[PDB]
Design a protein around this ligand. Structure first.
Ligand code: ZN
Ligand code: ZN
Lengths: 221, 221
């Protein structure tokens, strides 16, 4: 049983990792980290998506303790902070919980859609970080689980190409949720996340062969 | 502000780390990870203990999502497992959450009472592991927080010596909770944890100078 765990939220990136994973592994589980997120029903849609794509299971794990670690919460719980909703290292948490889950279901790999190519560069999403953490977790859980980051070096246009490579661009396009305002697919067209995704799609459509060439060159294939 | 975070449960080990930390730092926070643990009132006693010892704050964080990761829970939530209550890597979690907390309250160190000298050797409690994780977390949170493990190389007798070195053996002895059955201090005398602790105390009383010598030799002082 060659089996993987996909850190999954039902958006373009994580559904593109799931689609690729379903070709490369015999068995794929999805895990979703719910901290306020979406809502029961959106998470439930993402579960129908994974179910309908072929995931063997989809665990939804409440990580609302993250929100307890925001400065506003801490000050509210009478904790002194030095004089935001920002919480550091959330992906350290996610990768740790996915590994514990992977251990328990016999998965050899945790797959995550993090990358270094966005405007904002989160240090818990850097290639160097993920490798460093992988090495620590392997020691702490006493098992060799790999961390895979198929989207590490990809821009959005290339991510669209990858979906297309597995012949599923339209699945991603119609049936995922990227929009901050809850609109599936192409979304409201008016939020940050809609812009990023739509720019990507439009570069890919204009210059497909070039972007596909770029994609193949970076990832193997 | 030289400030530390003590991973704290109100037992002998974590109260010994707190006592030492209160000499070495200007400000100490305690964090307790509650997953079923004790109960509101015991946790509340451990909070009076920290308050009365001088902690500047004591955060109690619900980590009951750990229990959701046990095989019995997963099978109950209709997740396939390969055909216990055991959960791997719980201290990877604890150290990650303490670091996030330390970041938010401006702490330069997370202090933990883990060790390699017990009958059972948990790989998420090994010196090599803690260093490996420290290195990863520093990258993921973008700040140099140290992980300190004052009890790493100590047996129980030496841990008692350390309390005694800070002139607080009786505080640990009467006012902490090690016993599995909820009995403070010397406890029921009939559980594993009572035995370990009482053996320790009795070696320390029989051969004090020798054990103190051993302690000093390992930790500095
Ligand atoms: Zn939108
Ligand atoms: Zn007992």
């Amino acid at each position: 049983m060659k089996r993987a765990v996909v850190v999954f939220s039902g958006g373009q990136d994580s559904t593109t990792c799931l689609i690729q994973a379903l070709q490369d592994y015999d068995d794929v589980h999805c895990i979703t980290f719910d901290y306020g997120q979406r809502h029961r029903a959106e998470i439930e849609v993402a579960q129908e998506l994974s179910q309908k794509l072929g995931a063997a299971a989809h665990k939804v794990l409440d990580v609302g303790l993250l929100n307890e670690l925001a400065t506003s919460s801490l000050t509210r719980d009478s904790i002194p902070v030095p004089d935001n909703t920002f919480v550091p290292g959330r992906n350290i948490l996610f990768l740790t919980l996915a590994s514990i889950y992977a251990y328990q279901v016999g998965a050899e790999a945790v797959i995550t859609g993090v990358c270094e190519t966005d405007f904002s560069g989160y240090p818990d999403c850097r290639d160097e970080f993920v490798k460093a953490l992988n090495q620590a977790i392997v020691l702490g859980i006493a098992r060799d689980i790999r961390f895979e980051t198929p989207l590490m070096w990809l821009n959005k246009a290339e991510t669209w190409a990858l979906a297309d490579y597995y012949q599923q661009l339209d699945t991603v396009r119609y049936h995922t949720l990227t929009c901050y305002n809850g609109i599936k697919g192409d979304g409201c067209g008016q939020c940050a996340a809609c812009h990023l995704r739509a720019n990507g799609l439009a570069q890919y459509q204009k210059d497909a062969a070039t972007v596909m060439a770029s994609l193949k060159q970076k990832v193997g294939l």
